[PDB]
Structure formats: C-alpha cells, structure tokens
C-alpha cells in the first residue's frame, strides 16, 4: 500500500510492485506450453470458449510474429494482441533494414526491451500478458524464448504460462525434448495440456496447437487439422 | 508547515522555498571541502575517503579542472557534481568560442549559478544537491566563489563546506590572514581539513589543487605527501 499505485515507484524493500501485479494477472489466465523438439518448437494453448456463441477460432492466442516465429501469448488478450503487433513491426523493420529473417533471440530481446520500457514510466502500465517466442532454422536451430511482463527473457527447452504452469512443468520435465521429433511431441503436448485442465471450474476449451521446425520447412504454421485430431486422439487416450 | 515541504514550485506561508533548504542540508551533509584565497593564489582541498581499501583512489577526482584557470571542489552528491562540471566546462568553452578569451571566474560562476537555478523552477526536477566552490585567476587577482543549489553565488575569501563546516569556519577567521602566500594557504587548508578529518590524512585520502596565476593544477600524491609531511 502506498508504493504500489505506480510502476515508477520503487518499493521500500526494492521491488517494482506493478510488475509483480502484471505477473499475477498473467498467472490468472489459461495455460500455454511451448516444447522444443529435437527438430522444432511446438506451441499449445488451452483456449477457453467463454460462451457457446463463439466461432471456434475466435480470439485465438496463437499468433504468427513472422514467417518463422510463433507466439503463444497467455493473459490479457488485448495486451497480447498489441505485443503481437509490435513483434510483427519489429520483425518487418529488421528484415527491411538487414534483409534476413530476424533471429528469434534478437526479436525476443527487442520485444522484451519494448515490454520493459512500459514498466519504467508512470503514464503507462506493465503488459498483463506473458508470451513465448518460437522459431526454427537450420542455421540456428530451434529456439523457444518466454518473455513475461517483467521484461526478462531467456531461452527455454520447454515452458508453460498460465494457471497450471507448475502442473504443466511437472509433466513436461518428464518428457525427453532433447531427442524427440516434432511429430510425437505434438501428441505429447496435447496430452500434457489435457492433463492440466480443471474441467470442473472451466466449462470447456478448444485445444489449438502450433509448431515450427524441420517438418514445416522452417516456417511456423497452424498444425494441420488432419494431424491435430491425432494429437487430440492421443490426449483422449490419456485418461486425464 | 509540513504541507508545503514537498513541491519546489509552491510558496510556504512564511515564504520559504522548502526544497531548496532541504537540498542545502543534503549538501552540508556531504564530504568536507575547504578553500582559502591568498594574495598570490587560491587553494582548494577536499577529503577523499573511500569506504574500503578496495577503491582506486585515483579513479574519481573531487577536484577537477573547468579550464586552464578555473577549478572546482564540491561537498555533497558527486553524481550531481559530474553533470555540474560538464555544464561548467561547456559554458566556459562556449564563452571562449564566442569571445576567444578564457572565461573569467566571475562569469563562469554566474553561468553555473544560472544552470543550477534552471532546475529549481519546475516540478519534477530535483535541485542540484551539491554546492560548488570555484577557484580562479583572472586579471591577476585570485578568485573564490561558491555556487549553491538555490542559485546564489558569493565571493568567499575562505570557507569550508560539507560535514563539519561550522568547525571549519571557526578554524578560519583564526589561522587566516589576508596577506598570506600560496604555501601558507595550502598549509592552512590542509589544517582546516584536518580539524574536520576522521582518521589519518593519507596522500590518497586528501585531494588538493593550487589555482594561482600559472593556472589550476591538481597536486599529485607526491606534492600532497610532501606538504602533509611538512605540516605533520
């Protein structure tokens, strides 16, 4: 109280409270897990359909930052969409001024700097959405970076953002992402997401998958519906 | 009147710019500095103590030159002193370029005071928490001025700023004679630092600068050692 009304006021013990509040806000949303294959990066987000009137694909949380970069925002959807727009702008500017696809590391660093610049001013508030960036390139392998409201962003072999981040990590650490390919890893992602789901507190959800790697010629595209069901079939096979 | 001790752009009922007084207190709560003006030259001395033996005493110098014949010693917040010294150097060089003559101590001091006052007129800008003490030798007459965060400048003959400034001022008016010389002025300044100096005065802990007709120059540890041994 008193030191937590603005993002530019350091707490007496040395902690910017608004950033922690944004982290809590992102913690208040659904789970989104990114798992790095041996030859790609797979994104999976549990997209809760708040009402039956939605169009099975509305407000999807999987965004294509660029051709090779996939983003798996989870949290305040408006902030996530704004961040996706800024990431696309940065990717376009990097390609125009340098001529080659912006490396996932550099794009993540620039977007993280942009996010952190919004937790330093009193006239702006920290982004309430945490996002993970994924891409594949033979030149630089598959990279999966997660940037939260605080602005910190280091690479991950596999990360989960949302309500059941800890539950997702418990059953993701039990997966060998070092060697597996992006074919069975999709089924693993579907199963892990289905495990981390209340199903009594959340009425229903529409699993949406995504991947980028060698199997997709290096580009990031929505997982084909033909094989997406196979992942859904495996998840259903898993009892939870 | 606790209600008006916050903003620098509002007048207290008695008519006191509270923030300026608080900045002056912060200045007086800094490192000691004493300067004496002799008929031949000027002397500037500040106590340079680092919190541990792990600090390179030579990396940061409290006494810095503004031009070939202007000096600077401070007592208060050093980071503010760095910007103050940068502005002073820029002002001196602008005056030199416009007039092709080394900026007189009076004019450089006045412009530094104006720079200081520039920050004490709008909300959102903290007054400079350092009071500068300027040496000089222009037109063959030693000069010593002190510029404060309030923007006022004086012509101190000899004064000590920072911690234990009352004791330094009391020591002055006693060992100060208006007809001294540069060496005697240096000795008096070293003694004045001593009476407000905690611990041994090593060559690396006290930094002094003579600013006579020859110009301003920071005495190297060797000369400071010789002077302290002579006094000791």
């Amino acid at each position: 109280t008193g030191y937590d009304l603005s993002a530019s006021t350091f707490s007496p013990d040395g902690r910017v409270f608004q950033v922690e509040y944004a982290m809590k806000a992102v913690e208040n949303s659904s789970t989104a897990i990114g798992i790095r294959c041996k030859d790609g990066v797979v994104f999976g987000v549990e997209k809760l359909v708040l009402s039956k009137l939605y169009e099975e694909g509305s407000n999807k949380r999987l965004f294509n930052v660029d051709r090779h970069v996939g983003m798996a925002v989870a949290g305040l959807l408006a902030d996530a969409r704004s961040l996706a727009d800024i990431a696309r702008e940065e990717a376009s500017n990097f390609r125009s001024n340098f001529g080659y696809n912006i490396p996932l590391k550099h794009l993540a660093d620039r977007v993280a700097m942009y996010v952190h610049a919004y937790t330093l001013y009193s006239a702006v508030r920290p982004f309430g959405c945490s996002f993970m960036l994924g891409s594949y390139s033979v030149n630089d392998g598959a990279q999966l970076y997660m940037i939260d409201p605080s602005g910190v962003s280091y690479g991950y072999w596999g990360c989960a953002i949302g309500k059941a981040r800890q539950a997702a990590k418990t059953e993701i650490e039990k997966l060998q992402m070092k060697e597996m390919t992006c074919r069975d890893i999709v089924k693993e992602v579907a199963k892990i997401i289905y495990i981390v789901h209340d199903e009594v507190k959340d009425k229903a959800f529409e699993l949406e998958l995504s991947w980028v790697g060698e199997l997709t010629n290096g580009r990031h595209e929505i997982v084909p519906k033909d094989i997406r069901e196979e992942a859904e079939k495996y998840a259903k096979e898993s009892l939870k | 009147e606790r209600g008006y001790s916050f903003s620098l752009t509002t007048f207290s009922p008695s008519g006191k710019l509270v923030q300026i007084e608080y900045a002056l207190a912060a200045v007086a709560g800094g490192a000691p500095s004493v300067g004496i003006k002799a008929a031949n030259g000027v002397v500037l001395a500040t106590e340079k103590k680092q919190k541990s033996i792990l600090y390179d005493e030579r990396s940061v110098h409290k006494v810095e030159p503004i031009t070939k014949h202007i000096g600077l010693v401070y007592s208060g917040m050093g980071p503010d002193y760095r910007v103050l010294v940068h502005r002073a150097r820029k002002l001196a060089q602008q005056y030199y370029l416009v007039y092709q003559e080394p900026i007189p101590t009076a004019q450089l001091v006045q412009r530094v005071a104006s720079v200081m006052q520039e920050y004490t007129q709008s909300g959102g800008v903290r007054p400079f928490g350092v009071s500068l003490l300027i040496c000089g030798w222009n037109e063959g007459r030693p000069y010593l001025f002190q510029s404060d965060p309030s923007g006022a400048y004086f012509a101190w003959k000899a004064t000590a700023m920072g911690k234990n400034y009352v004791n330094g001022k009391t020591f002055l008016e006693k060992r100060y004679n208006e007809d001294l010389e540069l060496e005697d002025a240096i000795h008096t300044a070293i003694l004045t630092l001593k009476e407000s100096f905690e611990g041994q005065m090593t060559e690396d802990n006290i930094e002094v600068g003579i600013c006579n007709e020859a110009g301003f120059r920071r005495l190297t540890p060797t000369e400071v050692k010789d002077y302290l041994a002579a006094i000791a």
Partner: protein, 206 residues
C-alpha cells in the same frame, strides 16, 4: 529518383484462358553498358499474382522489399484474405502517384499480372502512375515493337493458349533483340494459373 542509373529492358505479358504469362530480360544496363546480366526482373508476390518491372532495378528492388513485407503481412494474419491482382494494382497506382506528387517518383515502369477467381488480371502502372487493363502489355520499347504485334493476335483471336502464349512472347522478345540496343538474350517466363505461379529461365534465340 531523378536520374536513373541502372535501368531495365521491356517487359512483356499476354493473358490466356486459364492464367497469364510475363517475361523480361536479365540485362541491367547502367547507361549503355551491360552492368549486370544475372538479375531477375520478375518475382512473385503471392500464389495467385506476380509482377515484373523495368526502370531502376534499385528502385524496383525497393519495391520488392515493400511488397514482400507488404505481401508477407497478408498471410501472417492468417485470415484467408490475400491481395487480389487488382488489389496489388490499386496499391501500386496510389503508391507511385503518391511518390510522384513529391517530385521523387520511382523511375520503374511496373507490370502486374495474376490469376484470381477464374479471371486473369494484367495491369501496368507506369513510372508516373498511369495504369490500365489490357490483354497484352509491354513496357518501354515493347510497347513500340512487341505491343503492336499482340493486338494483331488478340484482334483476330482474343483467346490464346499457353504454347501460343509462350512462342508469341518469344516472337515478341526475339524481335526485341534484333531492333533493340539494350536487350539481352536471357529472359525468364512467368506463368500464373490455378496450380500457382512458376518462374523459369533463361532462354536464348537464333
């Protein structure tokens, strides 16, 4: 762009039932000298549209980066909508007309042709912004030499075939080689149909 440095030859294109075909040389002639001879003057924008232009290749190259990012953004949204060949044409017309108004126009006479929803599109926006729809278009000299020929084939028979289109341009660029001082005997052919846009080449002549 006030004094072109590297320029381009004519650009030819004739529309047939089922798609459109364009071709262009690969001779970047700084002044009268063949500065470069392995450049591509016809690159695709999307699966159902392709373009190629004359004039400053640097100015056109700038257009390549603009369209690529401008085109690439189209599929990033993943909404299904893609810039129709008219859509790119309309953007181009305002793109150069806006640039010309500020005395810095792109000295790059473009031609954009594509196949969309069962109809072919063949537009040409000149270095200044003029643009129209014709069954067959040739940039620069091609208007003088190849363009007159294409009316004769279209006037008597406005319907053409891919092979008839293939040699027609060849009989079009061949005459370009004979009566032109800036042509080159290495050109690409761009074919756009339902199957997509394909670029192949080069090709020579006797």
């Amino acid at each position: 762009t006030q004094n072109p440095m590297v320029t381009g030859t004519s650009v030819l294109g004739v529309k047939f039932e089922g798609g459109v075909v364009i071709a262009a040389d690969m001779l970047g002639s700084y002044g009268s000298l063949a500065r470069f001879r392995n450049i591509s003057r016809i690159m695709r924008v999307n699966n159902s549209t392709m373009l190629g232009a004359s004039g400053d290749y640097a100015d056109f190259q700038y257009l390549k980066q603009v369209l690529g990012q401008m085109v690439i953004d189209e599929e990033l949204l993943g909404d299904g909508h893609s810039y129709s060949p008219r859509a790119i044409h309309s953007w181009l017309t305002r793109a150069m007309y806006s640039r010309r108004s500020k005395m810095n126009p792109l000295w790059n006479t473009m031609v954009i042709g594509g196949y969309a929803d069962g109809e072919s599109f063949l537009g040409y926006v000149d270095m200044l912004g003029v643009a129209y729809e014709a069954p067959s278009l040739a940039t620069g000299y091609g208007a003088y030499l190849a363009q007159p020929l294409l009316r004769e084939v279209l006037e008597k028979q406005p319907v053409l075939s891919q092979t008839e289109a293939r040699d027609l341009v060849e009989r079009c660029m061949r005459v370009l080689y004979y009566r032109d001082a800036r042509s080159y005997n290495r050109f690409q052919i761009a074919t756009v149909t339902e199957k997509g846009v394909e670029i192949e080449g080069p090709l020579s002549t006797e």
